[PDB]
Structure formats: C-alpha cells, structure tokens
Design a protein around this ligand. Structure first.
Ligand SMILES: */C=C/C(=O)CC[C@@H](C)[C@H]1CC[C@H]2/C(=C/C=C3C[C@@H](O)C(=C)[C@H](O)C3)CCC[C@]12C
Lengths: 240, 11
C-alpha cells in the first residue's frame, strides 16, 4: 500500500524537478558560447553549464521534504558534496544512447566525449561517467524514481562535514522507504526486479565519480589562468 | 561557513 504521505512526497518531488528543470534548455543561450575548434576552449561554456546546474540543484534541494528542518550548515555541506553527483544524475535526461552524447536540442548544445575532454577532464573521469549514463539509461526509471533518487542522493548522512548525521539519516530514510514502496506498488516486472538495489548502486558509482572529479578539478584549477575561466559559484562549491 | 553564495541561494 502506497501511503498518503508517500504519494505527497512523490508529488512534491516531481513538481520541484519540473520547476527546476527545463526540457527546452533555453537558458543555455546565456552561457558563453561553446567553442569546439584549441585547449579547454569548451570549458568556458561548460563551466557556465555546471554553474547553472548547481543553482537548479539548490532549488530542487529546498523543495525536498525535511530538508528545511536541517541546519543551514548541514544544508551547505550536503549541497557542496552532492552538487556534482546530482548534476550527473539529472543530466541523464538530456543524455542519449544514439550518439553517446548529452543532447540539448542543438548541435552547439549537444555535448560529446571530445567536448567534455576540451573542458579539461581526463578519460579517467569520462569513461566511467559515460558508462554511468548508459547504466542509468538502461534502468529506464520512472520520473518519480528519477526525482526520488536525486533527493536521496542529496540527503546523505555520510557526506563530509555533516554536523547532524542522525537527523539527516532520518530525512533520507523517509525518501528511501518511499522509493522502495513505489517500485513494489508502482513498478511492473521485469523492470521492477532488483531495481532498488541497482539505484543504490548508482549512488555508489556517483561517489566514485565525484572523487574522480575532485582530482580533475584540482588539476585544472591548479593553474590560476584556468581557475579564471570558472564561475564564482563553481569556485565556491568545488575549490578556491 | 566560508560559503556566502551557497548559503544565500539556500535561504
Ligand atoms: C569540467 C567539465 C564539466 O562540465 C564538469 C562536469 C562534467 C564532467 C560532466 C558532468 C555532467 C556532464 C553534462 C551534463 C549535461 C547537462 C547537465 C544538466 O544539469 C542539464 C541541465 C542538461 O541535462 C545538460 C554534459 C557536459 C559534461 C558534464 C558537465
């Protein structure tokens, strides 16, 4: 039996995502134009996209039930850690199997492996990242499943710097229980099979992905000339 | 907290 509270949680999350995510991608025009040629020509455009994406994730985080109860410091630590992971998860929607690329409705706004490479990221990140997207795509999650995973991802007790793990864990648990009930009640087999476990595994993959990004950001950021290309929020969230 | 922008965006 799917709970009334649980249905409520799902409805909030779908709206939060709808409010914070645009299928149109119109805002992309505002970012400095993509240059595909030239080293790191692209990064200026992608640095902007990551910065834009972080803002969108923050808006989504505010909606999640029980996020507000957490202290501001707890909110900050969670957002700082999961921002890259949430962006990778949310991106999946744009991402397409046909070209192995993130498709934003334009050739300019269509991003591929060599595009990501121009930003200044080693394959060490890219090959696992592409793989991740294919696996996430294979899952063919319901939008409710997609929204729930992002929130569960954001509200993790074990994120570094967390002042209050017990409170953060309780918020996460409510979402985890909501997701588990949805798959059983609302997901038909065979897709439903092992579905929660696979989704949880993706969170594990994200942690590894996140670690790789930090190693890459440090390298790319290490030089001041490159650190200049990034936005002030990217600097605040990732490093400075 | 050393995160003025992140805090402001949050509330
Ligand atoms: C350092 C370059 C960089 O862009 C950092 C992140 C890199 C490694 C990956 C992570 C996600 C990838 C992409 C996502 C695409 C979108 C993000 C999403 O928020 C959105 C609104 C659209 O779905 C587009 C594509 C480029 C490489 C990215 C950014």
């Amino acid at each position: 039996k799917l709970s009334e509270e649980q249905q409520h949680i799902i409805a909030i999350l779908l709206d939060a995502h709808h409010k914070t995510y645009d299928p149109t991608y119109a805002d992309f025009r505002d970012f400095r134009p993509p240059v595909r040629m030239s080293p790191l020509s692209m990064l200026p455009h992608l640095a902007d996209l990551v910065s834009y994406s972080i803002q969108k994730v923050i808006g989504f985080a505010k909606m999640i039930p029980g996020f507000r109860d957490l202290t501001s410091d707890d909110q900050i630590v969670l957002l700082k850690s999961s921002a890259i992971e949430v962006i990778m998860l949310r991106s999946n929607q744009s991402f397409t199997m046909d070209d192995m690329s993130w498709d934003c409705g334009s050739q300019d706004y269509k991003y591929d492996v060599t595009d990501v490479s121009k930003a200044g990221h080693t394959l060490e990140l890219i090959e696992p990242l592409i793989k991740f997207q294919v696996g996430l795509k294979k899952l063919n999650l319901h939008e409710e499943e997609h929204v729930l995973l992002m929130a569960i991802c954001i509200v993790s007790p074990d994120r570094p710097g967390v002042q209050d793990a017990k409170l953060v864990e309780a918020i996460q648990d409510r979402l985890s229980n909501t997701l588990q009930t949805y798959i059983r009640c609302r997901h038909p087999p065979p897709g439903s099979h092992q579905l929660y476990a696979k989704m949880i595994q993706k969170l594990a993959d994200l942690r590894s992905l996140n670690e790789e990004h930090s190693k890459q950001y440090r390298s790319l950021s290490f030089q001041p000339e490159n650190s200049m290309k990034l936005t002030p929020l990217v600097l605040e969230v990732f490093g400075n | 907290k050393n995160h003025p922008m992140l805090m402001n965006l949050l509330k």
